[PDB]
Write a protein that binds this ligand. Structure first.
Ligand SMILES: NC(=O)c1ccc[n+]([C@@H]2O[C@H](COP(=O)([O-])OP(=O)(O)OC[C@H]3O[C@@H](n4cnc5c(N)ncnc54)[C@H](O)[C@@H]3O)[C@@H](O)[C@H]2O)c1
Ligand SMILES: NC(=O)c1ccc[n+]([C@@H]2O[C@H](COP(=O)([O-])OP(=O)(O)OC[C@H]3O[C@@H](n4cnc5c(N)ncnc54)[C@H](O)[C@@H]3O)[C@@H](O)[C@H]2O)c1
Ligand SMILES: O=C1OC[C@](O)(CO)[C@H]1O
Ligand SMILES: O=C1OC[C@](O)(CO)[C@H]1O
Ligand SMILES: [Mg+2]
Ligand SMILES: [Mg+2]
Lengths: 342, 342
């Protein structure tokens, strides 16, 4: 009756996903897979998984699972998604989805031709505060949106837990800004044109750690997506995304501390949009950790109902195009048409 | 010794300039001029000015003043500055300086040819809080700046006091954005390239009331200038400009209620950068009103010492270039080279 999952990639963040898989009603992890046997043992012992594999080929060979959860780094995403599609196994794939938009399109096509669902684990839009902003705007409380700011300015050491982030020529837009752009899309709709600027401030890394992006939404709204890992503040907001929205009849302001302020024609309300601290969660990551449960529960529900997921492979293409457009615009200096990429 | 000014254009805002000239040490107003005899008489009686002129030509013929203060709307600025230059009378001119960058350049050249000081009355940079942001950044408290935001988002009815604002094809950038762009230059240095997006939300006006501008500064910093007169907030912040700067060693945050937060290698400090309330001032205009005295004292000090003003006609060209470029960019969707325009 309960769905049997396999998780490929028993890394740092997979721990959160395994915890959340327990909590998910209607699904559970029956097998795990990691290339590194030290990590394969650590996650296997912590969560009590009998079926353990050193390689995905062997995992897919034995089968006996209804979906696969791909939590590896981007290098192996294309191959694993192609293995999932070849074996008719529904697939979740971590962000970043593919190395390029081209790779992502081919991965989406293969899943559509194989008639299997594909969800990108894109969990920032599933955070409680972000969901609450969506709910307010959708209700018509502030009228039609015309301007937005989506901001993530931090000085937190993400590099200890994720050392590959300090490594490449690309960093903040690919790692983090991908989330902020997904949120911009989620709240204000798809993007027509995009223009971006990037900068490297931190001397200890190779890639860019500041990006300011200006989005022209198809509905007429303009927004700012500004992200930074070189912002030294007196109160560290990591990993909060702060959101301002102006509409024809009012405003939404999601400020630091999950404080949601809404002004409209009938006055002004202040509310607490904080995440629940789950038993297995840990501050300040508890915001992200709740959303892992939300998105994995959403996956499990949608697989039973047989409907399209929110951050599906097909949908997530429209987020990833913005990431590639941003890198292009930053190197060029010029505005980039998003529609011509897709 | 006591300088004698003539003021041309006895309008709404001239009243603030006249109160301020009273308070200025080393200068006062010996004559006034306006085409509208109701305004000439109202302002003449309020401030006890004996010499009153129905036209600037006759004023300049009689003379007996050491400088001229042009507080008319933009239409008259070119002619009055050209009259000043021909009569070798130092001139202050209100914003917007000229109708176009061409007109501005010719006005600047004419004053340089005649060897007379020309200052644009551009008073937002002379506000106590804006000056404090400059002082902090100048001191090296936050290191080299790399990112900024300069924001003026309001829903205040500016149209009652200034009806002309509701009538033009152009509105927020030439009226207000001009100030915010001047502040961006003042804080982060001159701009190499610029891109802008505009919108009309308010159905009772002819011009754009929302503008989002992305600046690439010559020193390598990126900045957002975002302005709006269609933003409906719980607390109305008019007419405060909010400022965020991020530097290599810290952050500056000038937030609503004139709160100034500076974070550096030592730690955070919180200051109250509120303006003074002069005897003749009124809430909420008192910050602007104080800055009228500051810029007018600055004029008077510099005229006595023979030095150039901060917002000189020459300097103001680099502000006005950004205004004209933003309109150009808003229609094109394209980035505009500022260097090519000057
Ligand atoms: N908010 C979020 O959802 C969030 C947060 C952090 C990281 N992430 C994403 O999660 C992904 C993984 O991040 P991480 O820090 O856990 O990486 P990690 O290096 O900690 O773990 C990756 C693991 O996958 C294994 N692996 C790699 N290729 C494999 C293959 N072909 N078969 C089997 N195992 C393989 C490695 O041995 C490694 O143990 C990244 O793409 C990252 O962007 C997402
Ligand atoms: N922060 C600021 O410094 C600030 C604030 C408000 C307005 N302003 C600027 O001040 C200027 C005037 O604004 P206002 O609201 O006082 O306008 P207003 O219409 O109230 O006043 C203009 C006055 O000038 C007179 N006038 C026009 N052309 C003339 C000429 N050739 N000779 C003699 N008199 C002439 C008119 O009769 C009128 O009384 C505008 O350019 C505006 O942008 C600046
Ligand atoms: O998705 C993410 O959330 C935070 C993070 O771990 C660091 O940028 C990133 O990988
Ligand atoms: O210069 C100015 O300062 C404030 C204002 O009056 C309204 O936009 C404008 O005219
Ligand atoms: Mg379970
Ligand atoms: Mg005086």
């Amino acid at each position: 009756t309960e769905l049997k999952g396999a998780l490929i990639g028993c890394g740092f963040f997979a721990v959160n996903q395994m915890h959340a898989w327990k909590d998910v009603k209607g699904a559970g992890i029956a097998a795990i897979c990691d290339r590194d046997p030290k990590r394969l043992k650590l996650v296997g012992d912590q969560f009590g998984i009998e079926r353990r594999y050193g390689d995905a080929a062997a995992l897919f060979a034995d089968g006996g699972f209804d979906f696969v959860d791909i939590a590896t780094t981007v290098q192996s995403h294309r191959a694993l998604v192609e293995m999932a599609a070849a074996h008719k196994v529904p697939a979740i794939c971590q962000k970043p989805f593919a190395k390029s938009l081209s790779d992502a399109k081919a991965m989406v096509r293969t899943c559509e031709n194989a008639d299997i669902p594909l969800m990108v684990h894109e969990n920032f839009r599933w955070q409680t505060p972000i969901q609450a902003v969506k709910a307010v705007l959708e209700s018509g409380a502030i009228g039609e949106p015309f301007w937005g700011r989506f901001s993530f300015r931090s000085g937190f050491d993400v590099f200890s837990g994720q050392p590959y982030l300090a490594e490449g020529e690309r960093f903040i837009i690919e790692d983090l800004g991908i989330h902020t752009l997904d949120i911009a899309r989620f709240i204000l709709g798809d993007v027509a044109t995009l223009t971006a600027r990037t900068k490297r401030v931190n001397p200890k890394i190779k890639g860019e750690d500041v990006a300011t992006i200006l989005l022209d939404h198809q509905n007429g709204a303009t927004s700012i997506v500004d992200v930074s890992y070189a912002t030294k503040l007196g109160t560290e907001p990591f990993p909060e995304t702060l959101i301002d929205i102006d509409g024809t009849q009012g405003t939404i302001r999601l400020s630091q501390g999950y404080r949601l302020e809404v002004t409209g024609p009938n006055g002004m309300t202040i509310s607490d949009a904080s995440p629940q601290l789950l038993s297995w969660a840990s501050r300040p990551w508890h915001n992200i950790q709740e959303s892992v449960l939300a998105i994995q529960q959403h996956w499990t529900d949608r697989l039973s109902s047989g409907g399209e997921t929110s951050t599906s492979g097909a949908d997530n293409l429209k987020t990833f195009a913005l990431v590639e457009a941003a890198y292009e615009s930053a190197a060029n200096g010029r505005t980039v048409d998003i529609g011509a990429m897709l």
